[PDB]
């Protein structure tokens, strides 16, 4: 009775969906919240 | 992408009328201005007309230059009357909000590549 292995796809999605949301969420951020002109 | 051109005369001994054309973006509802750049000296504010069609004018050029705007067109022109010596300097068009402006540079985002004028006694 051989089973299932844990996918390699989930494996690396585990940390390549994350990262690449937070490296999103710095670069909108960063370019969006210093946009207006100042004195 | 937004580009802003300009054209207008180099040399007069006098009389000129500078036009700016926009393209990319509709400026219907921006404030569009002429700034001037003389050697040396820091940008200053020559004019600028409202959607509402109200005029502004730096005291230097007021009641000597004129700034009109055809929306139809995306454009807005400058006519220069009672040239001096001192008028040598380049010329841009900008278009903006008037955020903490209508006089200041950092006010507006868009601007052209700018038009030399001389004047010649
Ligand atoms: C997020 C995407 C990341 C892609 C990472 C890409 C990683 C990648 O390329 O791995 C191969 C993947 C299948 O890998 P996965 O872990 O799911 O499947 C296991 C393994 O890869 C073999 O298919 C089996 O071993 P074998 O052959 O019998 O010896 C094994 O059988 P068992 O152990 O259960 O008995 C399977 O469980 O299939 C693709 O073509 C990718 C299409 C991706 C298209 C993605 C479109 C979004
Ligand atoms: C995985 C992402 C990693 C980082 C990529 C870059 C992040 C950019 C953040 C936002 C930057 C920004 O000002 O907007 C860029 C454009 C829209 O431009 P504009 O129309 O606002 O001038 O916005 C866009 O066109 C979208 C920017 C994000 C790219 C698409 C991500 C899709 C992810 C799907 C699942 C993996
Ligand atoms: C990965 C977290 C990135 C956070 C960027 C925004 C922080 C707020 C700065 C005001």
Same mark, same amino acid.
């Given at each position: %009775?051989?089973?299932? &292995?844990? &996918? %390699?796809?989930?494996?690396?999605?585990?940390?390549?969906?994350?990262?690449?949301?937070?490296?999103?969420?710095?670069?909108?951020?960063?370019?969006?919240?210093?946009?207006?002109?100042?004195? | 992408?937004?580009?802003?051109?300009?054209?207008?005369?180099?040399?007069?001994?006098?009389?000129?009328?500078?036009?700016?054309?926009?393209?990319?973006? +509709?400026?219907? +509802?921006?404030?569009? !201005?002429?700034?001037?750049?003389?050697?040396?000296?820091?940008?200053?504010?020559? !004019?600028?007309?409202?959607?509402?069609?109200?005029? *502004? *004018?730096?005291?230097?050029?007021?009641?000597?230059? +004129?700034?009109?705007?055809?929306?139809?067109?995306?454009?807005?022109?400058?006519?220069?009357?009672?040239?001096?010596?001192?008028?040598? !300097?380049?010329?841009?068009?900008?278009?903006?909000?008037?955020?903490?402006?209508?006089?200041?540079?950092?006010?507006?985002? *868009?601007?052209?590549?700018? +038009?030399?004028?001389?004047?010649?006694?």
């Amino acid at each position: %009775k051989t089973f299932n &292995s844990v &996918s %390699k796809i989930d494996r690396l999605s585990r940390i390549a969906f994350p990262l690449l949301f937070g490296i999103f969420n710095l670069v909108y951020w960063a370019t969006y919240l210093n946009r207006e002109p100042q004195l | 992408q937004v580009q802003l051109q300009e054209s207008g005369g180099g040399l007069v001994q006098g009389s000129l009328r500078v036009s700016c054309a926009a393209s990319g973006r +509709t400026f219907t +509802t921006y404030i569009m !201005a002429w700034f001037r750049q003389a050697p040396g000296k820091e940008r200053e504010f020559l !004019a600028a007309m409202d959607q509402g069609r109200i005029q *502004y *004018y730096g005291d230097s050029v007021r009641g000597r230059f +004129t700034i009109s705007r055809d929306y139809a067109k995306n454009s807005v022109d400058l006519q220069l009357d009672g040239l001096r010596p001192e008028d040598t !300097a380049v010329y841009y068009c900008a278009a903006g909000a008037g955020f903490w402006g209508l006089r200041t540079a950092s006010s507006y985002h *868009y601007w052209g590549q700018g +038009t030399q004028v001389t004047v010649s006694s």
